[PDB]
Coordinates of C-alpha atoms in Angstrom, one line a residue:
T1 CA 0.0 0.3 0.1
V2 CA 1.0 3.2 -0.8
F3 CA 0.9 6.7 0.8
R4 CA 0.7 10.1 0.4
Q5 CA 4.0 11.5 -1.7
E6 CA 3.4 15.2 -1.8
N7 CA 6.0 17.1 0.6
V8 CA 4.6 16.8 4.3
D9 CA 6.2 20.6 4.4
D10 CA 3.4 21.7 1.9
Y11 CA 0.5 21.1 4.1
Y12 CA 2.3 20.8 7.8
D13 CA 4.4 22.8 9.9
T14 CA 6.2 21.3 12.4
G15 CA 7.2 22.6 16.1
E16 CA 8.6 21.1 19.1
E17 CA 9.8 17.6 19.7
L18 CA 7.2 14.9 21.4
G19 CA 9.0 12.0 21.2
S20 CA 11.9 9.6 19.8
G21 CA 12.6 6.2 19.6
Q22 CA 14.9 3.9 17.8
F23 CA 13.7 4.8 14.1
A24 CA 11.3 7.4 14.7
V25 CA 11.2 10.7 16.0
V26 CA 7.8 12.6 17.1
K27 CA 7.3 16.2 16.4
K28 CA 4.3 18.5 17.0
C29 CA 2.6 19.9 14.1
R30 CA 0.3 22.0 12.4
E31 CA -1.8 21.4 8.9
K32 CA -1.8 24.8 7.0
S33 CA -5.1 24.3 5.8
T34 CA -7.0 23.9 9.2
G35 CA -4.7 25.2 11.7
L36 CA -5.5 22.1 13.8
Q37 CA -2.3 20.4 15.5
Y38 CA -1.3 16.9 15.1
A39 CA 1.7 14.8 15.8
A40 CA 4.1 13.4 13.0
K41 CA 5.9 10.2 13.4
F42 CA 8.5 10.2 11.1
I43 CA 9.9 6.4 11.0
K44 CA 12.9 5.4 9.1
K45 CA 12.5 3.0 6.2
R46 CA 15.0 0.0 5.5
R47 CA 17.2 1.3 2.7
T48 CA 18.1 -2.5 2.1
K49 CA 16.1 -5.6 1.9
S50 CA 18.4 -7.2 4.4
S51 CA 19.4 -3.9 6.6
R52 CA 18.9 -4.1 10.4
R53 CA 18.7 0.0 10.5
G54 CA 15.2 1.2 10.0
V55 CA 11.6 -0.3 9.9
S56 CA 10.6 -2.9 7.1
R57 CA 7.5 -2.2 4.7
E58 CA 5.8 -4.7 6.3
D59 CA 5.9 -3.9 9.6
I60 CA 5.0 -0.1 8.6
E61 CA 2.1 -1.1 6.8
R62 CA 1.0 -3.2 9.7
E63 CA 1.3 -0.8 12.2
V64 CA -0.8 2.0 9.7
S65 CA -3.5 -0.8 8.8
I66 CA -4.1 -1.2 12.4
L67 CA -3.8 2.4 13.4
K68 CA -6.5 3.4 10.6
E69 CA -9.0 0.7 12.1
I70 CA -9.3 2.5 15.5
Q71 CA -11.4 4.9 16.8
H72 CA -12.0 5.0 20.6
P73 CA -11.0 8.0 22.9
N74 CA -8.6 5.9 24.9
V75 CA -6.4 4.9 21.6
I76 CA -4.5 7.2 19.6
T77 CA -5.6 8.0 16.1
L78 CA -4.1 8.3 12.7
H79 CA -5.1 11.3 10.3
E80 CA -2.9 10.4 7.2
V81 CA -0.2 9.2 6.1
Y82 CA 2.7 10.5 4.0
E83 CA 6.0 9.0 2.9
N84 CA 9.0 9.9 0.8
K85 CA 12.0 7.8 0.0
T86 CA 13.3 8.0 3.9
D87 CA 10.6 8.0 5.9
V88 CA 6.8 7.2 6.1
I89 CA 5.3 10.0 8.5
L90 CA 1.9 9.2 10.4
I91 CA 0.1 12.4 11.0
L92 CA -1.6 11.6 14.3
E93 CA -3.5 12.8 17.3
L94 CA -2.2 15.2 19.1
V95 CA -1.4 13.8 22.7
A96 CA 0.2 16.7 24.5
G97 CA -0.4 15.7 28.1
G98 CA 3.2 13.8 28.7
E99 CA 3.7 10.1 29.7
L100 CA 1.6 8.7 32.7
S101 CA 2.7 6.4 43.8
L102 CA -1.0 7.2 43.9
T103 CA -4.1 6.3 45.8
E104 CA -6.4 3.5 44.8
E105 CA -8.9 6.1 43.4
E106 CA -6.4 7.8 41.0
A107 CA -4.8 4.5 40.2
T108 CA -8.4 2.9 39.5
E109 CA -9.2 6.1 37.6
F110 CA -6.6 6.0 35.3
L111 CA -6.9 2.0 34.9
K112 CA -10.1 2.0 34.1
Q113 CA -9.6 4.2 31.1
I114 CA -6.5 1.9 29.8
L115 CA -8.7 -1.3 30.6
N116 CA -11.5 0.5 28.2
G117 CA -8.8 0.9 25.4
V118 CA -7.5 -2.5 25.8
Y119 CA -10.9 -3.7 25.6
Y120 CA -11.7 -2.0 22.4
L121 CA -8.7 -3.3 20.8
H122 CA -8.7 -7.1 22.0
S123 CA -12.8 -7.0 21.1
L124 CA -10.8 -6.4 17.2
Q125 CA -8.7 -9.1 18.0
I126 CA -5.6 -6.3 18.0
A127 CA -3.1 -7.2 20.2
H128 CA -0.9 -3.7 21.2
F129 CA 2.6 -6.0 22.5
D130 CA 4.1 -2.9 24.1
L131 CA 2.1 -2.0 26.6
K132 CA 4.1 -0.1 29.2
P133 CA 3.7 3.5 31.0
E134 CA 5.9 5.3 28.4
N135 CA 3.2 4.3 26.1
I136 CA 0.5 5.4 28.2
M137 CA -0.1 9.5 27.6
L138 CA -2.5 11.9 29.0
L139 CA -4.3 14.6 26.6
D140 CA -3.9 17.3 29.7
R141 CA -1.9 16.7 32.8
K142 CA -8.8 13.5 36.2
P143 CA -6.7 13.3 33.1
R144 CA -7.5 11.4 29.8
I145 CA -5.3 8.7 28.7
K146 CA -4.2 7.6 25.6
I147 CA -2.5 4.3 24.5
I148 CA -0.1 5.1 21.9
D149 CA 2.7 3.6 20.1
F150 CA 1.5 0.6 18.0
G151 CA 4.8 -0.4 16.6
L152 CA 4.3 -4.2 17.8
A153 CA 0.6 -4.3 17.6
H154 CA -0.6 -7.5 15.3
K155 CA -4.0 -8.5 14.2
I156 CA -4.6 -11.8 16.0
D157 CA -6.8 -14.0 13.7
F158 CA -6.2 -17.5 14.9
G159 CA -5.9 -16.8 18.6
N160 CA -2.2 -16.4 18.5
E161 CA 0.9 -15.6 16.5
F162 CA 4.0 -17.0 16.3
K163 CA 6.6 -14.0 15.0
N164 CA 9.5 -11.8 15.6
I165 CA 8.0 -9.6 18.8
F166 CA 9.3 -8.6 21.8
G167 CA 9.2 -5.5 23.5
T168 CA 10.9 -3.8 27.0
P169 CA 12.0 -6.5 29.7
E170 CA 10.3 -5.4 32.6
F171 CA 6.9 -5.2 30.8
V172 CA 6.7 -8.6 28.7
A173 CA 4.6 -11.6 29.5
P174 CA 6.6 -15.2 29.9
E175 CA 5.1 -16.7 26.6
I176 CA 7.4 -13.3 25.1
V177 CA 10.5 -14.0 27.4
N178 CA 10.1 -17.7 26.3
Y179 CA 9.3 -17.2 22.1
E180 CA 6.2 -18.7 22.5
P181 CA 3.1 -18.3 20.3
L182 CA 1.4 -14.8 21.4
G183 CA -2.4 -13.8 21.7
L184 CA -4.0 -10.9 23.4
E185 CA -3.1 -12.5 26.7
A186 CA 0.4 -11.0 27.0
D187 CA -1.2 -7.7 27.2
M188 CA -2.9 -8.8 30.0
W189 CA 0.2 -9.1 31.8
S190 CA 1.8 -6.1 30.9
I191 CA -1.5 -4.5 32.5
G192 CA -0.7 -6.5 35.7
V193 CA 2.8 -5.0 35.8
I194 CA 1.4 -1.0 34.8
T195 CA -0.9 -1.8 38.0
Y196 CA 1.7 -3.2 40.3
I197 CA 3.9 0.3 39.4
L198 CA 1.1 2.2 39.6
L199 CA 0.4 1.4 43.1
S200 CA 3.8 1.0 44.1
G201 CA 6.4 2.8 42.4
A202 CA 8.3 -0.2 42.1
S203 CA 8.8 -2.3 39.2
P204 CA 7.9 -5.9 40.1
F205 CA 10.5 -8.0 38.1
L206 CA 13.3 -5.8 37.4
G207 CA 16.7 -6.4 37.9
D208 CA 20.5 -5.6 37.5
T209 CA 20.4 -6.4 34.1
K210 CA 17.8 -7.2 31.2
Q211 CA 18.6 -10.9 31.2
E212 CA 17.7 -10.8 35.1
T213 CA 14.6 -9.3 34.3
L214 CA 13.7 -11.4 31.8
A215 CA 14.8 -14.4 33.7
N216 CA 12.2 -13.0 36.8
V217 CA 9.7 -12.6 34.1
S218 CA 9.9 -16.4 33.4
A219 CA 10.0 -17.7 37.1
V220 CA 7.3 -15.1 38.2
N221 CA 9.8 -13.8 40.5
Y222 CA 7.8 -10.9 42.1
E223 CA 6.2 -10.1 45.7
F224 CA 4.4 -7.5 47.2
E225 CA 6.7 -5.6 49.3
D226 CA 4.9 -4.7 52.8
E227 CA 6.8 -1.6 52.9
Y228 CA 5.1 -0.5 49.4
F229 CA 1.7 -2.3 49.8
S230 CA 0.9 -2.0 53.6
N231 CA -2.0 0.4 52.6
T232 CA -3.0 -0.8 49.4
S233 CA -6.3 -3.4 49.9
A234 CA -6.2 -7.0 49.4
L235 CA -8.5 -6.7 46.6
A236 CA -6.1 -4.5 44.7
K237 CA -3.3 -6.9 45.3
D238 CA -5.7 -10.0 43.8
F239 CA -6.4 -7.8 41.0
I240 CA -2.6 -8.0 40.1
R241 CA -1.9 -11.6 41.1
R242 CA -4.6 -12.9 38.9
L243 CA -3.1 -10.7 36.0
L244 CA 0.9 -11.9 36.7
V245 CA 0.1 -15.4 35.9
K246 CA 2.7 -17.9 33.8
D247 CA 0.2 -19.7 32.1
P248 CA -1.9 -17.1 29.3
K249 CA -5.0 -19.7 30.0
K250 CA -5.1 -19.0 33.3
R251 CA -4.7 -15.3 33.5
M252 CA -7.8 -13.2 33.8
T253 CA -8.9 -11.4 30.2
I254 CA -9.6 -7.8 29.7
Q255 CA -13.8 -9.1 30.0
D256 CA -12.4 -10.5 33.6
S257 CA -10.4 -7.5 34.3
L258 CA -13.5 -5.0 34.0
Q259 CA -15.8 -7.6 36.1
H260 CA -13.4 -8.2 39.0
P261 CA -14.7 -6.7 42.5
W262 CA -11.7 -4.0 42.4
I263 CA -12.9 -2.7 39.1
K264 CA -16.5 -3.2 38.9
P265 CA -18.9 -0.3 40.1

């Protein structure tokens, strides 16, 4: 699939930088025709078939196709796509409040929005595969959150996928660490990690090196530290405990998480 090949600078003016990854930079921008503001994500293309630098066209097209499907208040939306020889430029909804220890009411206020967004995605059989605090942004810093960064997202048409998929060690599920088939359940593990950090300020599996962290993830090597959780409700801990489960089949689903007594009204 091809994208708009006019010069993006003829239609948008860029401003301050908003975000910056391995092969992508995000710039605030303004559409000349409407004055409306967006975030332009410049993704570097692979230059050769076997290069390791840049993002493969297959991966860029997958991200664009998924983004085109989504319209939900808790997930970033895609406005336009441009391209040239060096970059694909996604014109994305501007999320300007930056990245997301709290009281349980504050934590559940944000968590519920995360769950609503993930419920939408999983209902469409979209696994995000990169859920982590860095990918949970606010619109204005009770703020509105937006799930961002669909660079690892995959449609899960057969219940699972078996691809080269691997995010940030602190947040990946054991099946990712062990290179097993992956489904929607991996996102639910990541939500459990996010909830643990939201309530305590501490990362449940983090070791001194990436390999240690991954070994901890695979072994489900975490515990609730009393110094961090002494005033946290047992129901909150129950919610986390039913997500940080090694067997994906025994882990709470997104629907389970919405009906759990800590969440359900």
